[PDB]
Subunit: 483 residues, 3 copies
Amino acid sequence: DQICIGYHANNSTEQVDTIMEKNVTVTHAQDILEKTHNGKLCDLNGVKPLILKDCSVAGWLLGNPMCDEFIRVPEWSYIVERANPANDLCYPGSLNDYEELKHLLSRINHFEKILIIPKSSWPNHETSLGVSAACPYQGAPSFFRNVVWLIKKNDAYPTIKISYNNTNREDLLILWGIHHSNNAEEQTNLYKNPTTYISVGTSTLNQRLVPKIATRSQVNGQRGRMDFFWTILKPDDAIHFESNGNFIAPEYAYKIVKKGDSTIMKSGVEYGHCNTKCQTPVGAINSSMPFHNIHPLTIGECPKYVKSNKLVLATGLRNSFIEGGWQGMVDGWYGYHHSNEQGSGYAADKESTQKAIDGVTNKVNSIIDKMNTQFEAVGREFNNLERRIENLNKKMEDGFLDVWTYNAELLVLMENERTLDFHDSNVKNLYDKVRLQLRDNAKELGNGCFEFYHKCDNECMESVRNGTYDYPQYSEEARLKRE
Amino acid sequence: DQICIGYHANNSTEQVDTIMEKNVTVTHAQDILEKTHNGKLCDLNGVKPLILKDCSVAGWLLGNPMCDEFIRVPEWSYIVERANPANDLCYPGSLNDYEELKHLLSRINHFEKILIIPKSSWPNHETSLGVSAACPYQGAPSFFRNVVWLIKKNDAYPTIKISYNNTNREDLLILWGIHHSNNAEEQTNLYKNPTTYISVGTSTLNQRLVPKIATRSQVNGQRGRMDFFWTILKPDDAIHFESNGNFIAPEYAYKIVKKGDSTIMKSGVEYGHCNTKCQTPVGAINSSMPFHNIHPLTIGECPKYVKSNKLVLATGLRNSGFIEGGWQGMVDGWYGYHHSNEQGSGYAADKESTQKAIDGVTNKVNSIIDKMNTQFEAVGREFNNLERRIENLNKKMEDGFLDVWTYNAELLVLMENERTLDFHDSNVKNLYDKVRLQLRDNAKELGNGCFEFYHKCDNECMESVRNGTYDYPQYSEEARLKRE
Amino acid sequence: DQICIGYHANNSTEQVDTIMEKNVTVTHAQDILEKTHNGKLCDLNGVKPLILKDCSVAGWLLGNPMCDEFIRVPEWSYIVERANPANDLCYPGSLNDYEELKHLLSRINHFEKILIIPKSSWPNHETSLGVSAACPYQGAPSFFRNVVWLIKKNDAYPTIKISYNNTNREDLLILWGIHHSNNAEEQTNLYKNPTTYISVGTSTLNQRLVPKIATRSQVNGQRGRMDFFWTILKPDDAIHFESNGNFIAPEYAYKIVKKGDSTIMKSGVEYGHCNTKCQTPVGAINSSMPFHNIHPLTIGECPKYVKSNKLVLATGLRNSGFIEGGWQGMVDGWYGYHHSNEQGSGYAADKESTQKAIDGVTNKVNSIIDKMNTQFEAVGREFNNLERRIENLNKKMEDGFLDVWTYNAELLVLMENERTLDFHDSNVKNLYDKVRLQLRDNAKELGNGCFEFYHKCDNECMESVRNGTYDYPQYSEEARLKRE
Ligand SMILES: CC(=O)N[C@H]1[C@H](O[C@@H]2[C@@H](O)[C@H](O)O[C@H](CO)[C@@H]2O)O[C@H](CO)[C@@H](O)[C@@H]1O[C@@H]1O[C@H](CO)[C@H](O)[C@H](O[C@]2(C(=O)O)C[C@H](O)[C@@H](NC(C)=O)[C@H]([C@H](O)[C@H](O)CO)O2)[C@H]1O
Ligand SMILES: CC(=O)N[C@H]1[C@H](O[C@@H]2[C@@H](O)[C@H](O)O[C@H](CO)[C@@H]2O)O[C@H](CO)[C@@H](O)[C@@H]1O[C@@H]1O[C@H](CO)[C@H](O)[C@H](O[C@]2(C(=O)O)C[C@H](O)[C@@H](NC(C)=O)[C@H]([C@H](O)[C@H](O)CO)O2)[C@H]1O
Ligand SMILES: CC(=O)N[C@H]1[C@H](O[C@@H]2[C@@H](O)[C@H](O)O[C@H](CO)[C@@H]2O)O[C@H](CO)[C@@H](O)[C@@H]1O[C@@H]1O[C@H](CO)[C@H](O)[C@H](O[C@]2(C(=O)O)C[C@H](O)[C@@H](NC(C)=O)[C@H]([C@H](O)[C@H](O)CO)O2)[C@H]1O
Ligand SMILES: *[C@@H]1O[C@H](CO)[C@@H](O[C@@H]2O[C@H](CO)[C@@H](O)[C@H](O)[C@H]2NC(C)=O)[C@H](O)[C@H]1NC(C)=O
Ligand SMILES: *[C@@H]1O[C@H](CO)[C@@H](O[C@@H]2O[C@H](CO)[C@@H](O)[C@H](O)[C@H]2NC(C)=O)[C@H](O)[C@H]1NC(C)=O
Ligand SMILES: *[C@@H]1O[C@H](CO)[C@@H](O)[C@H](O)[C@H]1NC(C)=O
Ligand SMILES: *[C@@H]1O[C@H](CO)[C@@H](O)[C@H](O)[C@H]1NC(C)=O
Ligand SMILES: *[C@@H]1O[C@H](CO)[C@@H](O)[C@H](O)[C@H]1NC(C)=O
């Protein structure tokens, strides 16, 4: 007659690694890496992205004839641009501090186009001839919608002197431009005056632009260029313009209220009519895990980006003193095996099992819950002449990856070694617990099993489970069986 | 007739957490997170803050009339500027590379204002009428004090050609400016000549400033602007000024000796006449504790900022099997025995042990605290409105490190808290196995950590077991079969 | 008779630290910190760096007379510059976006000099008189080799209009410059035209340069300055020049193919005809170790840089059986046995237990080493004097990362060394318990980890664990009569 101690086993093929052991099959495990995304582009905390479709921020702000004319959405969480937008600046040129405009515009609380300078103004200049085949619309030379390319009237370009006082109680993005002529004959044809200037002045601005009449290479069929510039007029200030030529005037402006920052995402994915707290260019993440492998460039409260393909934490017994585990036990992690004629089968320690499941559950939940995330946009906004600042971002991003990867990977290895010793310690505690309540009525064979001199009743079996066994009641019976 | 092995207990209400257990009341513990600051702005390593008050670094340098600081301080460790300094540039304008000047001027070993171009010079120009109500002094038109606004004399502005050769052994901070006049008449009225220029040349500097005459908005009452520029003249180089008009010319300059860096702090806290190693905008920290939760923007040899509100390590043991419940009675040690016989009773501690524990856990707390390597650092923002992307780059780094330290520090507590408690469970079990290894046949195992000696328990064998000199042949036959 | 379980000890003086103990002497150890370097500058992944000697990138590119005319380096992995390169820009001036050019030119797959505008292309201008003392070859006045200083011919300077179309299939780096004169007399003398300009236009480039004529101090004996600019002409684009004076024209240009980035290294070490994955200014590293301390500014796949002098992991035993005994005698194993019978006395090892620990300890070492195989390429420093704020950003970052790696590395070594030592303690106790679980009634526990044999024992009887199930009743009667 005998009794043994044992641990649970199942069909699980899940394999974990420890700091000292590799490829250890376990009964239960948990991965703390999120590898899943929804594959769509969603709202971020209830606000929809501004999806510019084959347009750039420049083509949308200035009025590229082939960009959407109306701003349907008054607010966005992020701007979604295609990798190499097709439309941009139809008339070749430049937009000043473009990348900083895009950061300001990446998340806007309120956006609303308003007419600031009506074409009714400029009665002595021409408002109708300012078109180019570079900016085509419906088979006709057109031009940017929200600015005006003024031209000479009757071989006369009177100097312009115009002001706009912001009465709107909100900041105003205002845009203007300079046309760089290509020869001295072209200059006088478009603007009678041969030497020209643009003077822009606000409370914070003092600008003089002068054309650069020079030979350049054709882009979009034109050798001319247009350089655009922008300012924000604060709620009760004025902007003052003066020019005798080469003035791409403002017609429409945009009311801006800004309370937050995010980034421009370069993605071809499509809107999914969903909501998310974490967004990648490949898709959105719905996870509470600490780490992920979906994409570097995320927006929102996102898991940490690591280089690991799997991060699996053992939460159970090793699966096959006791030579092996009991596939037969089906009601607890730690248990007893009884052998008497009255009955046969297995049994399991209720309290010890729940203590351990709470133990490993709290170990996992801590690792997950201790991670706190800051809303952050990992997008990158730098020019061809800002490539040294680009590497700082790369160094930062890459360094945190190497940190988060090494820490997460060794946390798993270390804590799995602790998780496994935790199990084998609990079982031996039950073995010794039985050994002390069975001092002389038992012998040790070394296989986690005792030798019953006494005849253990099923009630005795349960009396030893409770620990309510009385050794005096059966001490003499052992002396009889012995020798 | 039994002897029991047990551990210490007290009245502690302090709780710690571990990976597998939460809200566990323990006897002794230590918090490695510092939360307290002195509420005042202090000196740093024995050097004093340049507490500029309601005046910008620009206003003080150029000599805004409304600021009472001239050569008050010759050495500083950090600058304190208010969030929106009231005075700044009294005449509307700008200062080029201001944010970089504030970095250069952030820590200066030697600063001295020296007159460099005297008003005795410029004898063909008017040095007396260069005032504006924008710069007001005591209700009367005034101007910046370390610079001279030169206007016409006798309806003439002869061209200025002047030079200054640094005869000092220290580098010099020299400041000049340009007036952008509002209309063609105001140009002629202030400087006879209609079209003007400012050339500035050194060994590194080649400048040409031309005025921008344009309609602009009224700031501090004037539609005009003055834009200021700066250079550092090396010890035997010379600066060369040529101007037709519109020249704001240097009268004074500053001798500069720089040997380190430390940002501009934004605070309204006041000088406490103290010294610190670590300065927050809300106060100062005097701790060896490795982590802190007071302010992000710290200047000095500082701990590491975390989002934690509590980072309590556990130095002792648990509080109310081998010890079904701990004994509150023991006051002299962490690990100890209890004797039960008519001769005597009570709880008695161990000395080879208990101190071994104290020494080991305390070395653990010190090892965590000591291995933090402190780098003097300045966390402060010096980025303007068109440098927000570099500013986000800064915030991403700052936030990335916060999240790195917070996670590791909290898991380190949770992980090392479990090992501490299991260390204590291990220490008790060793002594129980030693008592069983001494007495073998003469006593029986009860199972509650309380050995039962069939033979009468001896106060004299107590210290004997404590040391292991107990003799079992002495009482072998005695109570060989005491029960039947 | 007697049998005893013990562990190994040797002559090792190697000491380690745990979280709870300090200077613990161990039998075996392993350092995961690399301190050895090659002491020379090597190839980086099979590609030889460009060592520019005492010429700067500007001097090499523009053709300082005192530099190698050209070199057979079409490809290079990084650029090695001296701390203060001597030759640089002989004629005083500037190169625009120099630090970005050095980044672009830092790793280049194809670099070839080609002649884009011949001296034949300047019929009505002088190609030969454009020389200066500041730029000297053999004491003789010379000038930059790859650009042409064009001056008047026949007291006349007809305005220039030249265009170059990049027929090649690679990008071209093109350089040009403007000459700032000193006085109006200088201007007319070299360029009859008093008021001059330079327009440069490509598909993306729209430039107007105009000379600044002012007095400046002497640098390299000349008070004038020459400011240089660059662009990258794309295949099938054209560059269009126009000037009536002060034009330092392009003569040669560079065919560039760029596929990567890798900083300029400031170093004086000599080339070693070696190859390495990691290069340091002091020398090269050939290590798989996770961390190092050789120098911060490394380029290549490199260990993490920490502030530690040693990071020693315990891989062995505590060194001076299971109770208070380190056996120097058993050289044959790690865990082992000692027998004391009438046959003799000697030492034995347990191979099934010794190997289980060696395999596990090597995994501890290997896991810590190999899990940080997230080595990536890296860089050094590249910012100017008006870029100190961005330079601080770099420093806060690489310092902050240093504080993260050193604190994490050291605690890991302290934590796992504590765990290693405890892991050895549990192994011997299980050997003791194996021998204890067998031979239960036939032996006496003496308190030293050694058992007392009541019955007589043979060398063959011990048999270590070879049998492992020595007959419980074969000698049970003999020990029953050995009782008293
Ligand atoms: C309409 C056209 O194609 N014109 C074309 C001209 O036309 C040929 C002519 O040479 C030949 O003798 O007779 C043919 C009929 O039998 C036919 O009429 O061919 C010359 C060949 O070199 C072209 O240059 C010329 O094209 C115009 O050239 C202009 C100057 O170079 C300029 O590039 C014109 O482009 C526009 C544009 O579409 O952007 C024309 C716009 O109306 C004009 N807008 C404004 C507000 O002025 C715009 C502007 O001038 C420039 O963009 C400013 O830099 O240029 C191009 O059609
Ligand atoms: C001088 C004056 O009071 N001007 C005044 C103007 O004319 C008055 C008139 O109202 C009164 O009836 O009779 C006076 C004669 O006794 C005189 O004719 O009235 C207008 C009404 O709107 C006032 O705005 C005007 O004020 C002056 O206007 C100037 C030009 O716009 C200028 O803004 C003056 O400000 C100063 C300044 O205080 O900054 C005056 C300084 O002395 C002057 N400093 C220097 C070195 O030249 C300074 C300078 O011109 C500009 O800052 C350069 O841009 O301007 C303001 O008082
Ligand atoms: C020709 C000469 O040596 N000039 C010399 C001048 O006159 C000497 C005199 O000292 C000596 O005693 O007798 C000589 C006759 O036998 C002659 O009369 O003396 C002054 C005294 O200070 C010297 O500075 C002066 O030296 C020249 O001065 C120039 C104007 O300041 C200029 O700096 C000359 O430098 C060069 C140069 O080497 O860079 C001369 C180059 O040929 C010239 N190159 C071109 C393409 O024009 C170059 C150019 O003018 C400037 O760099 C443009 O800014 O300047 C220097 O020798
Ligand atoms: C400023 O004056 C000093 C002292 O005169 C100049 O330094 C040189 O000093 C020697 C001896 O004192 C003089 O003989 C030289 O004339 C000076 N060198 C030169 C090249 O001028 C210093 O250079 C002067 N600075 C300038 C550029 O005016
Ligand atoms: C420089 O030359 C190349 C090849 O001539 C130019 O590319 C064009 O080649 C096509 C071939 O069908 C010609 O029809 C066009 O005339 C060429 N020019 C254009 C404007 O497309 C290249 O464009 C020329 N570069 C410049 C800007 O002049
Ligand atoms: C493994 O055992 C579980 C019992 O819960 C069973 O549901 C599952 O189907 C088994 N898997 C296989 C492949 O038999
Ligand atoms: C604009 O008008 C507001 C009142 O509407 C006035 O306070 C302000 O001075 C004006 N701004 C300018 C500079 O024209
Ligand atoms: C340690 O012992 C071994 C074997 O006897 C020997 O090879 C080695 O030289 C010894 N090391 C020292 C420092 O004595």
